[PDB]
From Swiss-Prot:
Effect ascribed to mutating R97A: Severe reduction in C1P transfer
Assembly mode: Interacts with BPA1, PRA1F2 and PRA1F3.
Sorted UniProt keywords: Cytoplasm, Lipid transport, Lipid-binding, Transport
Protein known as: Accelerated cell death 11
Gene of this entry: ACD11
Matches recorded under InterPro entries: GLTP_sf (IPR036497), Glycolipid_transfer_prot_dom (IPR014830)
PANTHER family, per database record: GLYCOLIPID TRANSFER PROTEIN DOMAIN-CONTAINING PROTEIN (PTHR10219:SF43), GLYCOLIPID TRANSFER PROTEIN-RELATED (PTHR10219)
Keyword Transport tagged: yes
Biological role: Exhibits selective intermembrane transfer of ceramide-1-phosphate (C1P) and phytoceramide-1-phosphate. Does not transport ceramide (Cer) or GalCer, suggesting a requirement for phosphate in the headgroup for functionality. Transports in vitro sphingosine, but not glycosphingolipids. Also has some in vitro activity with sphingomyelin, a lipid not detected in plant tissues. The transport function may be not directly involved in regulating cell death.
Molecular function via GO: lipid binding; sphingomyelin transfer activity
Family stated for the protein in its record: Belongs to the GLTP family.
């Protein structure tokens, strides 16, 4: 019942698996881990419940994909063979949006850690969003998100919703930051090594 701990435990397993040469990452286990992140977006206010749904929709596709597909590589190789990589709703396309979700949380976590003593979430939330999603979300979406900033809870309140004190929240947020880093790099390299790009 400790959402940050579930997140930290799940991504630590992925970081371990992935710090192997030639890793075999199960879609099942990957999408499960990703869904553990979902509630964080809920904790960022009622406007951002919509950001949660947008994230949850992508993760849910990875979940359905995992019923008939073993690894993230196999998933991308299928889409590559059907030439449907960037088609709206393809597993690989959703995979890329989900990777950004993870990065989003990671940078948010960094920004929150680097802004201790500030009880407001506005600066960490806008900086992390500008960095991760500004190059990809259109003007329309970004305007909405910018409006969403006005419903942000306090820092202390967020922590209360995650049921952590300052010290514990810091350890589990830092853990996710540590674990998610090589995973994101691994996911980026999956797209780069197949010349798909990460910008679409
Ligand atoms: C007046 C009420 C206030 C409304 C304010 C609206 C709140 C912002 C809602 C943000 C949802 C935008 C998610 C973007 C959806 C799609 O454009 C993309 C591409 O999907 P595709 O075209 O392949 O179907 N979806 C994503 O990139 C999923 C990313 C989900 C996580 C991003 C939100 C995180 C924002 C954090 C802000 C603290």
């Amino acid at each position: 019942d400790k959402p940050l701990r579930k997140i930290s435990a799940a991504f630590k397993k992925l970081a371990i698996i992935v710090n192997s040469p030639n890793p075999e990452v199960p879609v099942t286990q990957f999408s499960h881990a990703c869904s553990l992140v979902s509630p964080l977006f809920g904790c960022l206010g009622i406007a951002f419940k919509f950001a949660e749904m947008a994230y949850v929709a992508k993760v849910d596709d990875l979940v359905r994909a995992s019923s008939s597909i073993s690894t993230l590589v196999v998933m991308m190789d299928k889409d590559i063979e059907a030439d449907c990589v960037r088609k709206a709703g393809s597993h690989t396309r959703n995979l890329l949006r989900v990777k950004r979700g993870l990065d989003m949380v990671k940078v948010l976590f960094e920004q929150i850690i680097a802004s201790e003593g500030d009880n407001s979430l506005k600066d960490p939330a806008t900086k992390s969003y500008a960095q991760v999603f500004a190059p990809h979300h259109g003007w329309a979406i970004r305007k909405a998100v910018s409006l969403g900033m006005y419903a942000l809870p306090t820092r202390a309140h967020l922590l209360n919703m995650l049921k952590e004190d300052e010290a514990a929240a810091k350890i589990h947020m830092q853990s996710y930051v540590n674990s998610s880093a090589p995973l994101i790099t691994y996911l980026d390299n999956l797209f780069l090594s197949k010349q798909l790009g990460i910008d679409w």
